[PDB]
Amino acid sequence: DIVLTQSPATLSVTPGESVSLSCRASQSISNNLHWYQQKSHESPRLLIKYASQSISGIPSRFSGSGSGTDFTLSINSVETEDFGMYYCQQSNSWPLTFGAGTKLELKRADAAPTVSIFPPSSEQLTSGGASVVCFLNNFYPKDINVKWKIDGSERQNGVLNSWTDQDSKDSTYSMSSTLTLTKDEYERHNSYTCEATHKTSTSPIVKSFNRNE
Amino acid sequence: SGGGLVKPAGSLKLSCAASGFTFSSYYMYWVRQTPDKRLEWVATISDGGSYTYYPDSVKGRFTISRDNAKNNLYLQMSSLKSEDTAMYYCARDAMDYWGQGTLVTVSAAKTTPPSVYPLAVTLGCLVKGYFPEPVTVTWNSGSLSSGVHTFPAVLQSDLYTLSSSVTVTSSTWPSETVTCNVAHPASSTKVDKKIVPR
């Protein structure tokens, strides 16, 4: 097996800038390398066959170069309709292999997170579960840090998080953090805190509530 | 087509309908994409169908085949493993796709309906403990789309959980009925939870 190491995993770039994505084969693969494009909810599209041979129709801004071990797929001046995944795959060894890919993402102004804490619904309690839900919405520097505080002390266990892809309207990110305790567990403390640190601010955003108002 | 949920060790036959070219002049491929977005080569089939090729991964379990007459490509998976879970595509030969996918899901888990909990500006919904992942959430039968944010379900243990949040105007809320519309096709379940104040 020949492992293809693409880099970097993700790349933030503004419309108009130009990029170079790498794909290095762990062995002289030769000209037998190929690039594919995959936009959200679409199957792959072959962009370049055999390293520099681009497919009829593909715009001129795409160009691939390489031999032996290092191959580059350049895009001179990125267009909005270019953000998606880029995979490279080889064709001269045994198990036909692919790269993990590179996610091309669209750079935008830093956007501050809008936080919301939502205590467990009574319906859920009557079930014997208490899920404390917190939504950090529409921030931009994807890197966000969420912390849970049960009566002032930090709580790591039982926290489940989920993120969203970049929003195709404002290019922001969103994420929900969920702390799941039992009803008994939940009813043993008073205040619950969802605390978020981000680039847009030096001091963390914090939202909280107490069990008995 | 031919996808779906299958229990480990099950069997399944996927198909692939070609049109727009000469199905017989090309070599066909079966390529999959795992939930974690990794792409894998499953099998290759010669133009006439005399030569087959597979990775060890599926060697002896998967069997690629075709019908140059009916313009059909087949994948016959046998002894399915959990790791075969993925989207399956076919392409003509550098692989040139034309498939829109078909999701196969290998799990010992049992289909089970969700539970929808209201979350009371920003409201939200909590769909918890449902199995066959396909779930759809809309607010006010979709008339209320914008400011909505459905988060990718994360598999707790044997079941899925997921949250959706709508951010409406504060003048509009308690004075106007807001509703979370959950639909779990996999067990013909449809639930409407009215987000209420206090």
PDB file of N, CA, C and O in Angstrom, chain A residues 34 36 38 42-44 46 49-50 87 89 94-96 98 100 103 116 118-119 121 123-124 127 131 133 135 137-138 160-165 174-176 213, chain B residues 31 33 37-41 54 56 89 94-97 99-100 116-120 122-124 126 128 149-154 156 163-165 193 198:
ATOM      1  N   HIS A  34      -4.072  11.640  -9.627  1.00  0.00           N
ATOM      2  CA  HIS A  34      -5.250  12.338 -10.148  1.00  0.00           C
ATOM      3  C   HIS A  34      -5.981  13.138  -9.081  1.00  0.00           C
ATOM      4  O   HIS A  34      -6.043  12.719  -7.935  1.00  0.00           O
ATOM      5  N   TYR A  36      -9.539  15.087  -7.619  1.00  0.00           N
ATOM      6  CA  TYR A  36     -10.987  15.127  -7.598  1.00  0.00           C
ATOM      7  C   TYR A  36     -11.479  16.253  -6.700  1.00  0.00           C
ATOM      8  O   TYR A  36     -10.807  16.680  -5.752  1.00  0.00           O
ATOM      9  N   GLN A  38     -14.977  17.619  -4.562  1.00  0.00           N
ATOM     10  CA  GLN A  38     -16.235  17.207  -3.959  1.00  0.00           C
ATOM     11  C   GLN A  38     -16.845  18.343  -3.139  1.00  0.00           C
ATOM     12  O   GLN A  38     -16.295  18.790  -2.122  1.00  0.00           O
ATOM     13  N   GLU A  42     -22.432  16.127  -2.969  1.00  0.00           N
ATOM     14  CA  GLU A  42     -22.240  15.791  -4.371  1.00  0.00           C
ATOM     15  C   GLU A  42     -21.131  14.750  -4.456  1.00  0.00           C
ATOM     16  O   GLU A  42     -20.241  14.710  -3.608  1.00  0.00           O
ATOM     17  N   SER A  43     -21.190  13.888  -5.451  1.00  0.00           N
ATOM     18  CA  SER A  43     -20.152  12.886  -5.579  1.00  0.00           C
ATOM     19  C   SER A  43     -18.963  13.542  -6.228  1.00  0.00           C
ATOM     20  O   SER A  43     -19.061  14.633  -6.789  1.00  0.00           O
ATOM     21  N   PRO A  44     -17.813  12.886  -6.151  1.00  0.00           N
ATOM     22  CA  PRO A  44     -16.580  13.404  -6.734  1.00  0.00           C
ATOM     23  C   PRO A  44     -16.655  13.754  -8.243  1.00  0.00           C
ATOM     24  O   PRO A  44     -17.463  13.206  -9.007  1.00  0.00           O
ATOM     25  N   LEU A  46     -13.866  14.424 -11.394  1.00  0.00           N
ATOM     26  CA  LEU A  46     -12.464  14.304 -11.742  1.00  0.00           C
ATOM     27  C   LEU A  46     -11.999  15.624 -12.363  1.00  0.00           C
ATOM     28  O   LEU A  46     -12.559  16.096 -13.358  1.00  0.00           O
ATOM     29  N   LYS A  49      -6.276  14.432 -14.623  1.00  0.00           N
ATOM     30  CA  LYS A  49      -5.837  13.059 -14.861  1.00  0.00           C
ATOM     31  C   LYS A  49      -4.371  12.978 -15.292  1.00  0.00           C
ATOM     32  O   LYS A  49      -3.969  13.565 -16.307  1.00  0.00           O
ATOM     33  N   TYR A  50      -3.637  12.238 -14.487  1.00  0.00           N
ATOM     34  CA  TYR A  50      -2.224  11.914 -14.727  1.00  0.00           C
ATOM     35  C   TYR A  50      -1.270  13.049 -14.326  1.00  0.00           C
ATOM     36  O   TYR A  50      -0.105  13.081 -14.750  1.00  0.00           O
ATOM     37  N   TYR A  87      -9.356  15.692  -3.475  1.00  0.00           N
ATOM     38  CA  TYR A  87      -8.679  14.428  -3.213  1.00  0.00           C
ATOM     39  C   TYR A  87      -7.774  14.088  -4.378  1.00  0.00           C
ATOM     40  O   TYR A  87      -8.033  14.470  -5.524  1.00  0.00           O
ATOM     41  N   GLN A  89      -5.576  10.706  -5.962  1.00  0.00           N
ATOM     42  CA  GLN A  89      -5.566   9.237  -5.950  1.00  0.00           C
ATOM     43  C   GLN A  89      -4.560   8.736  -6.978  1.00  0.00           C
ATOM     44  O   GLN A  89      -4.398   9.325  -8.052  1.00  0.00           O
ATOM     45  N   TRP A  94      -0.615  -1.587  -6.158  1.00  0.00           N
ATOM     46  CA  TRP A  94      -1.647  -2.591  -5.829  1.00  0.00           C
ATOM     47  C   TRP A  94      -2.964  -1.932  -5.401  1.00  0.00           C
ATOM     48  O   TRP A  94      -3.722  -1.413  -6.234  1.00  0.00           O
ATOM     49  N   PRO A  95      -3.321  -1.921  -4.105  1.00  0.00           N
ATOM     50  CA  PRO A  95      -4.560  -1.313  -3.670  1.00  0.00           C
ATOM     51  C   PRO A  95      -4.582   0.135  -4.049  1.00  0.00           C
ATOM     52  O   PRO A  95      -3.852   0.949  -3.407  1.00  0.00           O
ATOM     53  N   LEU A  96      -5.380   0.385  -5.050  1.00  0.00           N
ATOM     54  CA  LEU A  96      -5.621   1.720  -5.585  1.00  0.00           C
ATOM     55  C   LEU A  96      -5.964   2.655  -4.404  1.00  0.00           C
ATOM     56  O   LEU A  96      -7.004   2.495  -3.763  1.00  0.00           O
ATOM     57  N   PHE A  98      -6.235   6.513  -2.092  1.00  0.00           N
ATOM     58  CA  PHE A  98      -6.679   7.909  -2.085  1.00  0.00           C
ATOM     59  C   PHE A  98      -6.129   8.686  -0.864  1.00  0.00           C
ATOM     60  O   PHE A  98      -5.664   8.107   0.132  1.00  0.00           O
ATOM     61  N   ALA A 100      -6.678  11.600   2.226  1.00  0.00           N
ATOM     62  CA  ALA A 100      -7.726  11.937   3.180  1.00  0.00           C
ATOM     63  C   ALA A 100      -8.443  13.179   2.699  1.00  0.00           C
ATOM     64  O   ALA A 100      -9.600  13.413   3.041  1.00  0.00           O
ATOM     65  N   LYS A 103      -9.808  20.373   2.844  1.00  0.00           N
ATOM     66  CA  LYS A 103     -11.064  21.078   2.840  1.00  0.00           C
ATOM     67  C   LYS A 103     -10.740  22.538   2.548  1.00  0.00           C
ATOM     68  O   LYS A 103     -10.044  23.193   3.324  1.00  0.00           O
ATOM     69  N   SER A 116     -26.614  30.568  23.926  1.00  0.00           N
ATOM     70  CA  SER A 116     -27.912  30.291  24.538  1.00  0.00           C
ATOM     71  C   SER A 116     -27.916  29.001  25.325  1.00  0.00           C
ATOM     72  O   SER A 116     -27.548  27.939  24.803  1.00  0.00           O
ATOM     73  N   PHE A 118     -30.198  26.275  27.384  1.00  0.00           N
ATOM     74  CA  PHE A 118     -31.581  25.853  27.540  1.00  0.00           C
ATOM     75  C   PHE A 118     -31.714  24.698  28.573  1.00  0.00           C
ATOM     76  O   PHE A 118     -31.306  23.555  28.304  1.00  0.00           O
ATOM     77  N   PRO A 119     -32.276  24.953  29.781  1.00  0.00           N
ATOM     78  CA  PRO A 119     -32.471  23.916  30.823  1.00  0.00           C
ATOM     79  C   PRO A 119     -33.371  22.774  30.344  1.00  0.00           C
ATOM     80  O   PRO A 119     -34.146  22.960  29.356  1.00  0.00           O
ATOM     81  N   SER A 121     -36.254  20.147  29.439  1.00  0.00           N
ATOM     82  CA  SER A 121     -37.720  20.253  29.281  1.00  0.00           C
ATOM     83  C   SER A 121     -38.360  19.382  30.372  1.00  0.00           C
ATOM     84  O   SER A 121     -37.799  18.366  30.768  1.00  0.00           O
ATOM     85  N   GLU A 123     -40.864  17.528  30.093  1.00  0.00           N
ATOM     86  CA  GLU A 123     -41.201  16.252  29.498  1.00  0.00           C
ATOM     87  C   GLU A 123     -40.028  15.302  29.639  1.00  0.00           C
ATOM     88  O   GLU A 123     -40.199  14.161  30.049  1.00  0.00           O
ATOM     89  N   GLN A 124     -38.826  15.774  29.337  1.00  0.00           N
ATOM     90  CA  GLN A 124     -37.670  14.905  29.451  1.00  0.00           C
ATOM     91  C   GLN A 124     -37.444  14.427  30.894  1.00  0.00           C
ATOM     92  O   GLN A 124     -37.138  13.248  31.109  1.00  0.00           O
ATOM     93  N   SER A 127     -39.121  11.638  32.243  1.00  0.00           N
ATOM     94  CA  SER A 127     -38.561  10.399  31.714  1.00  0.00           C
ATOM     95  C   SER A 127     -37.413   9.956  32.609  1.00  0.00           C
ATOM     96  O   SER A 127     -37.004   8.796  32.588  1.00  0.00           O
ATOM     97  N   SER A 131     -31.187  16.761  30.121  1.00  0.00           N
ATOM     98  CA  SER A 131     -30.162  17.179  29.165  1.00  0.00           C
ATOM     99  C   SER A 131     -30.061  18.681  29.131  1.00  0.00           C
ATOM    100  O   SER A 131     -31.020  19.363  28.781  1.00  0.00           O
ATOM    101  N   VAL A 133     -28.798  21.789  27.370  1.00  0.00           N
ATOM    102  CA  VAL A 133     -28.361  22.110  26.029  1.00  0.00           C
ATOM    103  C   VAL A 133     -27.886  23.525  25.860  1.00  0.00           C
ATOM    104  O   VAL A 133     -28.520  24.464  26.341  1.00  0.00           O
ATOM    105  N   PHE A 135     -26.352  26.273  22.851  1.00  0.00           N
ATOM    106  CA  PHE A 135     -26.035  26.571  21.452  1.00  0.00           C
ATOM    107  C   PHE A 135     -25.119  27.808  21.276  1.00  0.00           C
ATOM    108  O   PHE A 135     -25.489  28.935  21.630  1.00  0.00           O
ATOM    109  N   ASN A 137     -23.851  29.934  18.450  1.00  0.00           N
ATOM    110  CA  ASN A 137     -24.224  30.098  17.033  1.00  0.00           C
ATOM    111  C   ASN A 137     -23.600  31.317  16.322  1.00  0.00           C
ATOM    112  O   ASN A 137     -23.451  32.396  16.920  1.00  0.00           O
ATOM    113  N   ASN A 138     -23.296  31.002  15.059  1.00  0.00           N
ATOM    114  CA  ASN A 138     -22.786  31.908  13.999  1.00  0.00           C
ATOM    115  C   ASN A 138     -21.529  32.679  14.418  1.00  0.00           C
ATOM    116  O   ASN A 138     -21.551  33.907  14.573  1.00  0.00           O
ATOM    117  N   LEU A 160     -21.328  16.283  25.206  1.00  0.00           N
ATOM    118  CA  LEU A 160     -21.343  15.858  23.808  1.00  0.00           C
ATOM    119  C   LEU A 160     -21.457  17.097  22.961  1.00  0.00           C
ATOM    120  O   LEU A 160     -22.313  17.950  23.207  1.00  0.00           O
ATOM    121  N   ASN A 161     -20.596  17.195  21.957  1.00  0.00           N
ATOM    122  CA  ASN A 161     -20.614  18.344  21.073  1.00  0.00           C
ATOM    123  C   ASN A 161     -20.850  17.959  19.625  1.00  0.00           C
ATOM    124  O   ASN A 161     -20.603  16.823  19.210  1.00  0.00           O
ATOM    125  N   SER A 162     -21.324  18.946  18.895  1.00  0.00           N
ATOM    126  CA  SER A 162     -21.617  18.795  17.477  1.00  0.00           C
ATOM    127  C   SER A 162     -21.475  20.132  16.776  1.00  0.00           C
ATOM    128  O   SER A 162     -21.975  21.159  17.259  1.00  0.00           O
ATOM    129  N   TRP A 163     -20.793  20.060  15.654  1.00  0.00           N
ATOM    130  CA  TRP A 163     -20.543  21.236  14.826  1.00  0.00           C
ATOM    131  C   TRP A 163     -21.260  21.133  13.481  1.00  0.00           C
ATOM    132  O   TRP A 163     -21.702  20.035  13.085  1.00  0.00           O
ATOM    133  N   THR A 164     -21.331  22.315  12.848  1.00  0.00           N
ATOM    134  CA  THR A 164     -21.915  22.477  11.504  1.00  0.00           C
ATOM    135  C   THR A 164     -20.867  22.893  10.491  1.00  0.00           C
ATOM    136  O   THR A 164     -19.827  23.418  10.857  1.00  0.00           O
ATOM    137  N   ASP A 165     -21.143  22.649   9.212  1.00  0.00           N
ATOM    138  CA  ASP A 165     -20.219  23.042   8.150  1.00  0.00           C
ATOM    139  C   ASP A 165     -20.366  24.536   8.070  1.00  0.00           C
ATOM    140  O   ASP A 165     -21.221  25.118   8.734  1.00  0.00           O
ATOM    141  N   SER A 174     -21.383  27.077  13.652  1.00  0.00           N
ATOM    142  CA  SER A 174     -22.328  26.947  14.734  1.00  0.00           C
ATOM    143  C   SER A 174     -22.061  25.616  15.415  1.00  0.00           C
ATOM    144  O   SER A 174     -21.504  24.694  14.817  1.00  0.00           O
ATOM    145  N   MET A 175     -22.418  25.510  16.680  1.00  0.00           N
ATOM    146  CA  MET A 175     -22.158  24.272  17.378  1.00  0.00           C
ATOM    147  C   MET A 175     -23.016  24.162  18.585  1.00  0.00           C
ATOM    148  O   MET A 175     -23.354  25.160  19.208  1.00  0.00           O
ATOM    149  N   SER A 176     -23.369  22.937  18.924  1.00  0.00           N
ATOM    150  CA  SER A 176     -24.174  22.731  20.097  1.00  0.00           C
ATOM    151  C   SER A 176     -23.411  21.808  21.027  1.00  0.00           C
ATOM    152  O   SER A 176     -22.768  20.844  20.579  1.00  0.00           O
ATOM    153  N   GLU A 213     -35.034  28.922  40.012  1.00  0.00           N
ATOM    154  CA  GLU A 213     -34.949  30.307  39.524  1.00  0.00           C
ATOM    155  C   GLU A 213     -34.462  31.400  40.511  1.00  0.00           C
ATOM    156  O   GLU A 213     -33.378  31.980  40.256  1.00  0.00           O
TER     157      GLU A 213
ATOM    158  N   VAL B  31     -16.580   2.479  -5.855  1.00  0.00           N
ATOM    159  CA  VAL B  31     -15.782   3.247  -4.902  1.00  0.00           C
ATOM    160  C   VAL B  31     -16.671   3.691  -3.745  1.00  0.00           C
ATOM    161  O   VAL B  31     -17.766   4.199  -3.968  1.00  0.00           O
ATOM    162  N   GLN B  33     -17.360   5.843   0.102  1.00  0.00           N
ATOM    163  CA  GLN B  33     -16.953   6.958   0.952  1.00  0.00           C
ATOM    164  C   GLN B  33     -17.596   6.752   2.323  1.00  0.00           C
ATOM    165  O   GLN B  33     -18.826   6.712   2.468  1.00  0.00           O
ATOM    166  N   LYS B  37     -15.702  10.593   5.753  1.00  0.00           N
ATOM    167  CA  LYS B  37     -15.338  11.180   4.431  1.00  0.00           C
ATOM    168  C   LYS B  37     -14.134  10.520   3.712  1.00  0.00           C
ATOM    169  O   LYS B  37     -13.630  11.031   2.702  1.00  0.00           O
ATOM    170  N   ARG B  38     -13.656   9.391   4.190  1.00  0.00           N
ATOM    171  CA  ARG B  38     -12.516   8.707   3.526  1.00  0.00           C
ATOM    172  C   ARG B  38     -13.018   7.936   2.302  1.00  0.00           C
ATOM    173  O   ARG B  38     -14.075   7.307   2.347  1.00  0.00           O
ATOM    174  N   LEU B  39     -12.256   7.976   1.213  1.00  0.00           N
ATOM    175  CA  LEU B  39     -12.640   7.279  -0.015  1.00  0.00           C
ATOM    176  C   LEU B  39     -11.916   5.958  -0.182  1.00  0.00           C
ATOM    177  O   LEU B  39     -10.704   5.897   0.005  1.00  0.00           O
ATOM    178  N   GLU B  40     -12.629   4.890  -0.523  1.00  0.00           N
ATOM    179  CA  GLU B  40     -11.931   3.618  -0.737  1.00  0.00           C
ATOM    180  C   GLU B  40     -12.326   2.912  -2.021  1.00  0.00           C
ATOM    181  O   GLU B  40     -13.488   2.937  -2.435  1.00  0.00           O
ATOM    182  N   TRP B  41     -11.346   2.269  -2.643  1.00  0.00           N
ATOM    183  CA  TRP B  41     -11.600   1.505  -3.850  1.00  0.00           C
ATOM    184  C   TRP B  41     -12.131   0.141  -3.409  1.00  0.00           C
ATOM    185  O   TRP B  41     -11.532  -0.573  -2.593  1.00  0.00           O
ATOM    186  N   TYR B  54      -9.953  -6.564  -6.680  1.00  0.00           N
ATOM    187  CA  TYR B  54     -10.438  -6.127  -5.365  1.00  0.00           C
ATOM    188  C   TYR B  54      -9.286  -5.915  -4.384  1.00  0.00           C
ATOM    189  O   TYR B  54      -8.199  -6.488  -4.541  1.00  0.00           O
ATOM    190  N   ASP B  56      -7.709  -6.393  -0.467  1.00  0.00           N
ATOM    191  CA  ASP B  56      -7.901  -7.495   0.505  1.00  0.00           C
ATOM    192  C   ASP B  56      -9.181  -7.232   1.313  1.00  0.00           C
ATOM    193  O   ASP B  56      -9.946  -8.157   1.628  1.00  0.00           O
ATOM    194  N   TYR B  89     -20.526   4.380  -4.715  1.00  0.00           N
ATOM    195  CA  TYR B  89     -20.553   4.976  -6.054  1.00  0.00           C
ATOM    196  C   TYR B  89     -19.943   4.027  -7.081  1.00  0.00           C
ATOM    197  O   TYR B  89     -19.173   3.118  -6.739  1.00  0.00           O
ATOM    198  N   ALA B  94      -7.906   6.851 -13.793  1.00  0.00           N
ATOM    199  CA  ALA B  94      -8.715   7.994 -13.399  1.00  0.00           C
ATOM    200  C   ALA B  94     -10.196   7.685 -13.581  1.00  0.00           C
ATOM    201  O   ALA B  94     -10.705   7.617 -14.706  1.00  0.00           O
ATOM    202  N   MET B  95     -10.847   7.514 -12.449  1.00  0.00           N
ATOM    203  CA  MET B  95     -12.273   7.187 -12.404  1.00  0.00           C
ATOM    204  C   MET B  95     -13.117   8.422 -12.680  1.00  0.00           C
ATOM    205  O   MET B  95     -12.936   9.480 -12.067  1.00  0.00           O
ATOM    206  N   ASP B  96     -14.023   8.259 -13.611  1.00  0.00           N
ATOM    207  CA  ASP B  96     -14.964   9.316 -13.942  1.00  0.00           C
ATOM    208  C   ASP B  96     -16.333   8.877 -13.500  1.00  0.00           C
ATOM    209  O   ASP B  96     -16.960   8.040 -14.144  1.00  0.00           O
ATOM    210  N   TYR B  97     -16.773   9.450 -12.381  1.00  0.00           N
ATOM    211  CA  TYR B  97     -18.063   9.139 -11.775  1.00  0.00           C
ATOM    212  C   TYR B  97     -19.225   9.490 -12.659  1.00  0.00           C
ATOM    213  O   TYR B  97     -19.076   9.861 -13.828  1.00  0.00           O
ATOM    214  N   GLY B  99     -22.255   8.561 -10.574  1.00  0.00           N
ATOM    215  CA  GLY B  99     -23.173   7.970  -9.621  1.00  0.00           C
ATOM    216  C   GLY B  99     -23.538   9.009  -8.592  1.00  0.00           C
ATOM    217  O   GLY B  99     -22.714   9.868  -8.295  1.00  0.00           O
ATOM    218  N   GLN B 100     -24.758   8.977  -8.068  1.00  0.00           N
ATOM    219  CA  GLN B 100     -25.116   9.949  -7.051  1.00  0.00           C
ATOM    220  C   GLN B 100     -25.031   9.343  -5.642  1.00  0.00           C
ATOM    221  O   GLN B 100     -25.323  10.005  -4.640  1.00  0.00           O
ATOM    222  N   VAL B 116     -39.102  13.749  21.059  1.00  0.00           N
ATOM    223  CA  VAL B 116     -38.827  15.140  20.749  1.00  0.00           C
ATOM    224  C   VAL B 116     -39.104  15.993  21.982  1.00  0.00           C
ATOM    225  O   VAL B 116     -40.183  15.919  22.554  1.00  0.00           O
ATOM    226  N   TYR B 117     -38.119  16.783  22.403  1.00  0.00           N
ATOM    227  CA  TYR B 117     -38.279  17.632  23.582  1.00  0.00           C
ATOM    228  C   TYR B 117     -38.176  19.080  23.206  1.00  0.00           C
ATOM    229  O   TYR B 117     -37.234  19.472  22.523  1.00  0.00           O
ATOM    230  N   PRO B 118     -39.125  19.904  23.665  1.00  0.00           N
ATOM    231  CA  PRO B 118     -39.073  21.325  23.330  1.00  0.00           C
ATOM    232  C   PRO B 118     -37.985  21.952  24.155  1.00  0.00           C
ATOM    233  O   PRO B 118     -37.601  21.403  25.188  1.00  0.00           O
ATOM    234  N   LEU B 119     -37.494  23.037  23.658  1.00  0.00           N
ATOM    235  CA  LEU B 119     -36.427  23.822  24.287  1.00  0.00           C
ATOM    236  C   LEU B 119     -36.757  25.316  24.305  1.00  0.00           C
ATOM    237  O   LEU B 119     -36.502  25.913  23.297  1.00  0.00           O
ATOM    238  N   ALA B 120     -37.343  25.747  25.362  1.00  0.00           N
ATOM    239  CA  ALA B 120     -37.620  27.162  25.395  1.00  0.00           C
ATOM    240  C   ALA B 120     -36.707  27.700  26.511  1.00  0.00           C
ATOM    241  O   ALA B 120     -36.145  26.904  27.261  1.00  0.00           O
ATOM    242  N   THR B 122     -34.055  32.565  20.595  1.00  0.00           N
ATOM    243  CA  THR B 122     -33.634  31.266  20.113  1.00  0.00           C
ATOM    244  C   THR B 122     -34.356  30.173  20.903  1.00  0.00           C
ATOM    245  O   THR B 122     -34.304  30.126  22.140  1.00  0.00           O
ATOM    246  N   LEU B 123     -35.041  29.340  20.158  1.00  0.00           N
ATOM    247  CA  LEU B 123     -35.685  28.144  20.701  1.00  0.00           C
ATOM    248  C   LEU B 123     -34.885  26.987  20.160  1.00  0.00           C
ATOM    249  O   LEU B 123     -33.829  27.172  19.551  1.00  0.00           O
ATOM    250  N   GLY B 124     -35.338  25.790  20.345  1.00  0.00           N
ATOM    251  CA  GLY B 124     -34.567  24.679  19.816  1.00  0.00           C
ATOM    252  C   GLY B 124     -35.328  23.383  20.006  1.00  0.00           C
ATOM    253  O   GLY B 124     -36.384  23.349  20.641  1.00  0.00           O
ATOM    254  N   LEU B 126     -34.846  18.964  20.573  1.00  0.00           N
ATOM    255  CA  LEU B 126     -34.015  17.846  20.993  1.00  0.00           C
ATOM    256  C   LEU B 126     -34.622  16.515  20.565  1.00  0.00           C
ATOM    257  O   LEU B 126     -35.565  16.012  21.190  1.00  0.00           O
ATOM    258  N   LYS B 128     -33.941  12.830  20.485  1.00  0.00           N
ATOM    259  CA  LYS B 128     -33.044  11.953  21.218  1.00  0.00           C
ATOM    260  C   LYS B 128     -33.415  10.461  21.124  1.00  0.00           C
ATOM    261  O   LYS B 128     -34.589  10.089  21.147  1.00  0.00           O
ATOM    262  N   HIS B 149     -30.770  26.011  12.488  1.00  0.00           N
ATOM    263  CA  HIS B 149     -29.441  25.385  12.553  1.00  0.00           C
ATOM    264  C   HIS B 149     -29.542  23.957  13.045  1.00  0.00           C
ATOM    265  O   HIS B 149     -29.478  23.688  14.241  1.00  0.00           O
ATOM    266  N   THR B 150     -29.697  23.019  12.152  1.00  0.00           N
ATOM    267  CA  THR B 150     -29.778  21.631  12.601  1.00  0.00           C
ATOM    268  C   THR B 150     -28.362  21.071  12.702  1.00  0.00           C
ATOM    269  O   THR B 150     -27.582  21.116  11.747  1.00  0.00           O
ATOM    270  N   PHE B 151     -28.048  20.544  13.869  1.00  0.00           N
ATOM    271  CA  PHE B 151     -26.697  20.039  14.134  1.00  0.00           C
ATOM    272  C   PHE B 151     -26.557  18.555  13.822  1.00  0.00           C
ATOM    273  O   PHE B 151     -27.449  17.745  14.133  1.00  0.00           O
ATOM    274  N   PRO B 152     -25.434  18.186  13.195  1.00  0.00           N
ATOM    275  CA  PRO B 152     -25.149  16.809  12.864  1.00  0.00           C
ATOM    276  C   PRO B 152     -25.253  15.915  14.065  1.00  0.00           C
ATOM    277  O   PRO B 152     -24.517  16.118  15.078  1.00  0.00           O
ATOM    278  N   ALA B 153     -26.161  14.972  13.894  1.00  0.00           N
ATOM    279  CA  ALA B 153     -26.445  13.956  14.890  1.00  0.00           C
ATOM    280  C   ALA B 153     -25.145  13.283  15.285  1.00  0.00           C
ATOM    281  O   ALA B 153     -24.275  13.025  14.441  1.00  0.00           O
ATOM    282  N   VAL B 154     -25.042  13.045  16.562  1.00  0.00           N
ATOM    283  CA  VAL B 154     -23.911  12.326  17.127  1.00  0.00           C
ATOM    284  C   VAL B 154     -24.475  11.112  17.842  1.00  0.00           C
ATOM    285  O   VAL B 154     -25.422  11.224  18.630  1.00  0.00           O
ATOM    286  N   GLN B 156     -24.818   8.593  20.397  1.00  0.00           N
ATOM    287  CA  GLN B 156     -24.522   8.410  21.830  1.00  0.00           C
ATOM    288  C   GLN B 156     -23.931   7.013  21.978  1.00  0.00           C
ATOM    289  O   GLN B 156     -22.724   6.805  21.848  1.00  0.00           O
ATOM    290  N   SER B 163     -29.713  18.135  17.800  1.00  0.00           N
ATOM    291  CA  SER B 163     -30.397  19.392  18.208  1.00  0.00           C
ATOM    292  C   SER B 163     -30.659  20.329  16.996  1.00  0.00           C
ATOM    293  O   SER B 163     -29.850  20.307  16.072  1.00  0.00           O
ATOM    294  N   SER B 164     -31.765  21.099  16.968  1.00  0.00           N
ATOM    295  CA  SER B 164     -32.015  22.093  15.887  1.00  0.00           C
ATOM    296  C   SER B 164     -32.431  23.390  16.560  1.00  0.00           C
ATOM    297  O   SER B 164     -33.253  23.374  17.476  1.00  0.00           O
ATOM    298  N   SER B 165     -31.906  24.517  16.096  1.00  0.00           N
ATOM    299  CA  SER B 165     -32.256  25.775  16.732  1.00  0.00           C
ATOM    300  C   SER B 165     -32.713  26.859  15.780  1.00  0.00           C
ATOM    301  O   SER B 165     -32.065  27.155  14.786  1.00  0.00           O
ATOM    302  N   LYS B 193     -43.870  19.220  18.041  1.00  0.00           N
ATOM    303  CA  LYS B 193     -43.725  19.704  19.411  1.00  0.00           C
ATOM    304  C   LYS B 193     -43.816  21.216  19.394  1.00  0.00           C
ATOM    305  O   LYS B 193     -43.046  21.887  18.713  1.00  0.00           O
ATOM    306  N   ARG B 198     -42.368  29.771  29.468  1.00  0.00           N
ATOM    307  CA  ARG B 198     -42.189  29.466  30.894  1.00  0.00           C
ATOM    308  C   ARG B 198     -41.734  28.026  31.131  1.00  0.00           C
ATOM    309  O   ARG B 198     -42.562  27.171  31.558  1.00  0.00           O
TER     310      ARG B 198
END
